[model samples]
Target: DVFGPWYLGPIAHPAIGIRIPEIILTGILRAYKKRNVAGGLMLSFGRETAPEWVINAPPGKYEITRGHTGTSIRKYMTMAAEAAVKEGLVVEIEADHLTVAPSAAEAVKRISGVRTEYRMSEKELGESLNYIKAEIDEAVSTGYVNFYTIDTCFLIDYSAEEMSPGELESKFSTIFGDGAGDLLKRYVGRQFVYIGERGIPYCFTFTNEEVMRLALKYRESLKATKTICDYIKSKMSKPYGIEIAFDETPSLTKCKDMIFYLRELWEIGIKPDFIAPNIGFEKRKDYMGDLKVLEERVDKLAAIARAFGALLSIHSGSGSSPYSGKGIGTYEALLRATGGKIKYKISGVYIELLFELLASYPKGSKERGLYEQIFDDVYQFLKKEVEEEGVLASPELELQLKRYEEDVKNGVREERDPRADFFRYYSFVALNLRDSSGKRYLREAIVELYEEDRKFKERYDKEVEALTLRLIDGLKFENNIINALAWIRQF
Candidate 1:
């Protein structure tokens, strides 16, 4: 097997594109040799980009797609394989965010600017099953995939968190019926305790109402997880790992819910290797909250996850810039919280770094010209979508536009500054724009510029490598696999 025995071990998951995989692998391998350690590289991409419908859609149909950055399951897997072989490193391919929605259109909306929440019915879940099966089908065709991040956020019922005791019990009964007693008996009145890092003590006790609330909240989500896990198991002869993407919800994940979800999954015979929870981090922004509070929250979650033989997977693992360390002492806080035994992920930042580098070139240079075009394309396209109030439009995008205009009118910012929040947040949309030939010309231009210009290409490669090394060093991911090897020998 090309995949290594690092399923439950600490891993660094980096979402990659055609040009970044080789550069990222170089950084990973360099970190390994620098410390005489070994670790895993999980090459991943979001499901919004690789949905079967998008891959098979007619050319020129979509002028702005989420994963239109030249990343598909096949392309990412091929890139990972080539780079791993060249570096003599072992890597795993993960189909990140195998999201389930009522329809393909609704699924992409998850990644697009839209923020509306929709609940799935039984029929809807069944239809979503068909959708994800098609996704899995494509992933399996690559013969390189070893991990799947099942995102059933559509099934999560957040209203349960605010329901009255009567409402909670009634809804729980309606859903569980005859099976309610057995499920309730497992968690109700149970005393669970654990000692987290720094010998911090934690004890958990569940009341009948609390248990009902959790079941009401996660019962359907857990069942969907089991079903997806079973389907994946049936399809794969080789070993693989599962990660549950519960991070997309609006609320912060509580330790009790973490315990409830893990125990329920185990009871159903589906044990994920990792579980991502909402840890109060925002995408494309740095964590500006109190570091001590963040550490405590993560520590409790990590303790509960350890109790379940899983690691806490941190999502939204990027900052305002590639080099920001996600916030001041943020990496240190996470390292202290999880003790360097965590699975970390960073998507979109590498591409962001590429754009930032291109923006730094001389004003009249080709690199600067391409960067401006991409910026203007993203700004104008999103402005049109907002003006038309398209399905992809959201209050968030509208507010960003409003602020940009206000800044320009007040002379607080230039008319076309890339530093504006609007540009930074939606710049990646440029990847999906097409030329007259129905080709993804902008994505191609970025790649072509990198290849044809010696100085720019070298600078870009170094920046990519440097960005990766920062994550490795900042998170203390270096030399992690050595501990895994020692554990293997003991077994």
Candidate 2:
């Protein structure tokens, strides 16, 4: 009945680190091309430590938001292009997760002659626009960057989730308060309210939880998305996809929440190509739940995404491994749920695995010992990032991480209690680490390692091939929707 569609191959791709690009990229890229398939190569759109920024700079000179600069983004594009060309395969180079944050905009100075973290407020929308403008320029410089992920985690109204129902009502009333009695009568206590004219009775329905959901963030978050969309549309002549992310919020993205957001997006003439919802995935751990429950939930999300003509993309999709719960059974579950029609992502996890591989070398060896030092720096930086760097830190996160060190130090065996999230966070030092020796481990040494040792490169290649095959086969993402027109003809 059907044949010749772009099915039977890897659909989604792994976003790898640039510091050891050759090793990681060579390994995975070759595997795909060898088997003759296509996948994506994602680099963090916000990691200031992106290898390109430090590749040409001296040690300790890495800058935040370098992903938006011409020099760094150029290097990212060139390297990705080279790898794809070598393999004679197509690779999608993504300017990933273009996140907007108040801290990135500027510094705040106190009256007492001190500076603090950039505080977020309603006024910061302009700050976000300026950052996006600079990034758009960077994209123009490279003349590429095909896929763009718009991350609006910070702007989303999450207070509604944390507050009590009474508190929620009070907070919400401030906006739709006593002044608007007519609209209030229609919506305030109703199970379902008529939002817009559809000639279809109660075109949208809402419960108490979901009404507050829209009431709290309905203005800011979606407005931010529209702003970014307008900006990207103004600059780019080519086609691109917008992926809205609510991954950082500490609650599940309810089915109603998604439907509401999609309708809002459509009303403004914006339809996202993908949407990443919080499916209760934590970083660097195996999913802890019943398989069928996870399966059922994913199916529901996928079905929702399908109705909106968007792909359900999963983020923080790392730490899955075969040995134990580090990330066991997730890929299989995802495939079973979405039937391979999904955009599964992994960012920090691959970087963590690289560190693990290097750590396995001789204890005091150049590579092994080098990672040891970088890990120390990363740990120190994050430990005090809140007080020193003005980054937000959770009190609970402090004890959680503190336990990781004690657990590992006291011979808890990194395997059983891998402190997966903790390890993943610190291992990112590989992106911009520089010892006082002025040696750049992430950039210079990693490059040399790939160039000099045949066995080392061979091992890297084998590991990558093993990994690429493992995930591609595991997820079966190749069995995607072949007849695109079928969905179109439905409605």
Candidate 3:
């Protein structure tokens, strides 16, 4: 089999947009050969943000970059598998972020940078299911995706968090019907506890108020997860993984809520291989907060996950840049916190490194020219988006452009510079932009450069491999198969 078991600890999921799987997998191989250790690779992308079609379609017919380069599930998985085979490695292909939104249109709107408040009604839930089914068919068609991350946090009722006990109980009873009382009996007065390999005792016991808060908050979200998990199970005849993505929510995941969420999923017979909870890390940025605080949070959350026979998966694992080291001692903290039983993911950082490399080329070179053109394309697109209120337009994006211009005018920064935050944030859109001839010219030019220029290719490969190695060593992902083997012996 091309894909392997995810129970192996500390797998790395990198979203490869440039068709450079060899760089990622070969780096994994290098790490393994050197230290006599190994970890699995899971190449992933989201449904709305990255993949173009749920079913196979010709290029230019569908638009989905999620701000990264374009590729279909079939096409992307094929490249990943070929690279793994060439590198003599077995990896996992993940259909990441199988999200449920109110409507297909609103789902795509998320990619546009609009912060829409999604409320899941019966009508919307049905709509999202139909939308996700199409995605399922596409991923199943490839017969390569062995890990699925279900992201339905949009269905969560965030308002329940602050509701009064009476209000929460009434709403919970209304939603849970006659089963509400019985559900409360299971959690309200019980003590949940565990002490894992780290020798730290972990425990949680919910109050009636807390019970109602979590039960009401996650009722719809959990229901959607069960439906999606069952659908994936029915479609696949081979071994695969189910992951819960609760990281997209607004608040830091509390210990009680994490335990509640996992137990509820288990009660419904849904055991995810891992769960991504909001651990206070933002996307495309390094951990700027106190390291000890971050470590303690991870330690507690990871213990909760381990108590449920799963591990914690860190999302938004990308730092400020390829060389930022994901903040000082961030990886070491995670290793200590979780005892190296974790999964880490990053997507936009790969593309960030691409542009960074392009910008480094000598002046007047084609590489440097492409880099500037990509930046200009994104800048202009964003400028028009703010002005015209296009589908990708939002008030916050407007403010960003306004601020960038003011900074440039005030001599606070240079215009069209790569260091501009606005450019770095929105530059992924360059891959989806089309030229007057109806071509994704920037994407085309990038592929051409990589194919034609051996020097550029070698340098880019080295950078990616170095980046992958940092993640591997930092997360203590080396010797994960050994961990998996040792873990299984206990059972």
Candidate 4:
């Protein structure tokens, strides 16, 4: 379930600590209000604790987990399931626990009636049908869970021994046999596992070499995997329906090919059950121009997914900005662009490392060394800007600008501790996690902080906001330009 803009509100913050509960409640209420909507409510809980709280707290339409292990984590999920049933919420749980841990096996045992699933990671399965079947059997026998999903993690290798595309395809075909056709047939009578394809960026950017190798070896995987069109037709058969799930990266700009690929997939026979697109908050002013373009691309992607019978998925959609009102406008723009066909896969939204850090620190005291070091690095590297001429935009330069003259003259520290500012901004952004009243309280605090010293607050706010907005914009634009260039025709 992709968290909607209504729950995110308008502040750029990280998801952590006190803010998580608030965001969950907001999502629950929003889903409740829109229960009759065709798409239904997409509520996500990562791990077990999050859903446990949501189920006990309020009733919503659909409940899902971003990732899960076949281990003890499922125990906590069982608690959540029990709570959801008590509240009468329709539960749709996706478990990604076949490989990470053994605890997922237990989690499956706890749930009795709901349709639980086990997802095969590309990393662990690696074109090995025997391994896949064994894991599926384990899940079905131990937990009574029948549904399954095969993911690209099977293809990705983290170790150094990377296979060439030919070798990769040979290995893949050998395992799936007859290019995944026979495997689908094997599971015909039973619930066939839906396979997940990685986004283009993962292949084009992160696994460029492996992707090229795969393309060289099994040109079909590249063509078939690019979108779901042909692959779906080839794979879909009696007793086994197919669902295509893909990850979307905001940083990947090739919208045309992506659009074509998705369209073809829909036409061929692949129906998408889930879409996981990433949204993050890191300031980059130079990239501001690209935000609109990226937003448009996402909008189209969502629309195509809906038209093709798929759910719009949000991946890595944590942070404060996407969930809050401040940045939610852009999120809403994407949603409007897609005509509300999108769904979200929200992880990290509830328990981010940032919050864990805050929890590590005591209140009313300066963050210790490690915390300070990490925060400083992010501020310096992520917040700092560079120009075409290779000149770094320093804080001093910002202070020297005429537009900032008044701010500088007002005795604002041109070079204040960015670390402190980060905390303040993060805390303020987390306001989305609170109730409307809590949000009001947070806003009042910001006003008080600003009133205490208007110049400093203004300068601080401008710099931070500008940095985040620009960073995202720059990435989007650069990616889009590259995407456009990649597809350019040669004479």
Scored by TM-score, the top model is 1
**Candidate 2 regions with alpha-carbon error over 4 angstroms:** 1-19, 48-71, 104-119, 159-204, 207-215, 320-328, 376-421, 435-439, 478-491
| Candidate 3 residue lDDT tens string, 1-491 | 22233333323333223333433344444544454443444434443233344323444454333323455556666666565556555455667778776543354445334577856778867866876776677767766666788888788887898987778778887888988888888898787886644567877788878888888888888988888888888899766777788887667888888888999999989887788988878766788788888888888888788867788888778787888858988888888887777888766676778888899877799888898888888988888876876555667678778888899999998766676777766776776677666666887788788778888877876787777777767776665555545543444
Taking all chains together, the TM-score of candidate 3 against the true structure is 0.89
RMSD of each: 3.0, 7.4, 3.4, 17.0
Candidates in order, TM-scores: namely 0.91, 0.76, 0.89, 0.39
Give the residue spans of candidate 1 off by over 4 A: 1-48, 51-53, 60-63, 102-114, 121-124, 484-491
Candidate with best lDDT: 1
Per-residue lDDT over 111-188 for candidate 1, one digit per residue giving the tens place of the 0 to 100 score: 434577766777877966876776677777777776788887788877888998888888889989999999889988
The residue pairs in collision within model 2 are 320-327
On TM-score, the stronger of 3 and 4 is 3
Clashing pairs in 3: 49-66
Cα-lDDT of candidate 2: 0.58
Q: Which segments of candidate 4 are over 4 A away from where they belong?
A: 1-73, 96-150, 153-245, 248-270, 277-289, 320-328, 353-491
Candidate 3 root-mean-square deviation in Å: 3.4
Off by over 4 Å in 3: 1-68, 102-115, 120-124, 196-198, 484-491
